[PDB]
Paper text:
X-ray crystallography structures revealed that OXA-48:P68A leads to increased flexibility within the OXA-48 structure, likely contributing to elevated CAZ hydrolysis.
In the first OXA-48:P68A structure (resolved to 2.50 Å), we found CAZ bound to chain A/C (OXA-48:P68A-CAZ), as well as two empty active sites (chain B/D, OXA-48:P68A)—thus, one CAZ molecule per dimer. CAZ binding forces R214 in the β5-β6 loop to move out of the active site. As a result, R214 would then clash with parts of the Ω-loop (D143 to S165) in the native OXA-48. Therefore, P68A seems to impose increased flexibility within OXA-48, and this enables both the β5-β6 loop and Ω-loop to occupy alternative conformations and consequently favors CAZ binding. This supports the hypothesis that P68A increases the flexibility and changes the plasticity of the substrate binding site in OXA-48, allowing the hydrolysis of bulkier drugs such as CAZ. While OXA-48:P68A allows CAZ binding by a displacement of the β5-β6 and Ω-loops, we hypothesize that for other cephalosporins, the active site of OXA-48:P68A might still be too narrow and rigid to achieve significant hydrolysis.
Author numbering:
A (entry chain B): 24 to 265
B (entry chain A): 24 to 148, 162 to 265
The structure:
Amino acid sequence: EWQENKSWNAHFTEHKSQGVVVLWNENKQQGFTNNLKRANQAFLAASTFKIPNSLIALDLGVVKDEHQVFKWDGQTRDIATWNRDHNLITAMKYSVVPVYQEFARQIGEARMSKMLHAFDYGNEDISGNVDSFWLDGGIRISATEQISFLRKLYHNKLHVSERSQRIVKQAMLTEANGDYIIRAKTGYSTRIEPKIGWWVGWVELDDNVWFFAMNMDMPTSDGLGLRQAITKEVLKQEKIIP
Amino acid sequence: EWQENKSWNAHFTEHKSQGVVVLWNENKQQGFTNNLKRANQAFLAASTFKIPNSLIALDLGVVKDEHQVFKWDGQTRDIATWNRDHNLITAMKYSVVPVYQEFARQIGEARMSKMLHAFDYGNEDIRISATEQISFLRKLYHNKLHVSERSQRIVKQAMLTEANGDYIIRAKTGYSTRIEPKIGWWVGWVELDDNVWFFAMNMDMPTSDGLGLRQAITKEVLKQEKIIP
Ligand SMILES: *C(=O)[C@@H](NC(=O)/C(=N\OC(C)(C)C(=O)O)c1csc(N)n1)[C@@H]1NC(C(=O)O)=C(C[n+]2ccccc2)CS1
Ligand SMILES: [Cl-]
Ligand SMILES: [Cl-]
Ligand SMILES: [Cl-]
Ligand SMILES: [Cl-]
């Protein structure tokens, strides 16, 4: 069912890095990874938690639609793009943490936890600050656990409205051309060791969907582009994209 | 409300071509075009019709959703990408006429004519102008058409054409050669962080080798107006 392809490691070593890529061929229900053990190692979800946090917020009406504006609170923050108004689309594109902490507080522990148990999401543990548990709280999720969650999202199978799932898959739009469509969220876990980078989503082809989840050691923010670059080297190595 | 910017004509004649491009800045609610007369001329919609058709099919049930598989009837047509199975996403992409022909049969004239008239589409008794395309497209963007929100969302999904960290383009191509003038279309919009530019262009397409120019000339104009890099 799974299959180890350690060749992929050359892409991590080329860039002097370490991590795991996990691929899943929907048509052939076959997974692939350079490291089956690390594929199942659970880390903080960091901003990949913005997928489930969007779904819940939309489904509870915290977010009415992807046009609703969330005004900047006027607190200038190290991340220049955080210091403006945002709707769901730009908030996900630019991982606007404070916008989603506010979603989190309006959701509340109770519903947050109930929903993560409905979603089957990683270790389902929200314990910590309701508005930071995904950065420095209890929640743990592995790459293969990201793929099970995303596959459900992709078939409108989560226990929230079809519309909610449709609007979140829209906000995940990352890349589209005439060979593929990538829908995906980045993560950068940096408050608790180990420092890692996430990239989770999937690539849509004419006649298949390839779901991916990768994470990798991220000591300094200089390697943040490697998250996507190494994934695509794998996808390009496996002929999923040209 | 409509400014003529004849400067754009150079993007047409550098490619030894004649046409119109129509832009609509949505924030400011102002449009701009290289040719005001040609922007209100109605040409054959050709495949740009696949948009209202997709909506009606969806909102009626001919199409359950964008995953449903429309199997090839085994008849080999000259466009190779038609000679296979397709879903809404790939039938819009490849402009698979015989798939859409079938949608329309199952929709049937009566229902089709009633809805086309509810969208106030092309003619009220198909030809439509570049500026009528924009106006239809703006309602689609805001989910203001008289079909379900779901209908409208799935069609915008199926209109996805290009996306990066500078813009998203949702659009549909069109090409007709039965009748003069032979015209290509490209209609849709480009989404920015805090604005959305609708576009509609058409151009004399006297052969076919210049089909890429529908997209190329449109981007040269978006590039000029600083809307995209
Ligand atoms: C879209 O507009 C479709 N156009 C047609 O199918 C053509 N004619 O339709 C008639 C009946 C004439 C009409 O008025 O609608 C047609 C295609 S080629 C030719 N000599 N007549 C599809 N047009 C698109 C497109 O937007 O360009 C096609 C994409 N394509 C083009 C060239 C080669 C392969 C694929 C296919 S048809
Ligand atoms: Cl979050
Ligand atoms: Cl909803
Ligand atoms: Cl989309
Ligand atoms: Cl379909």
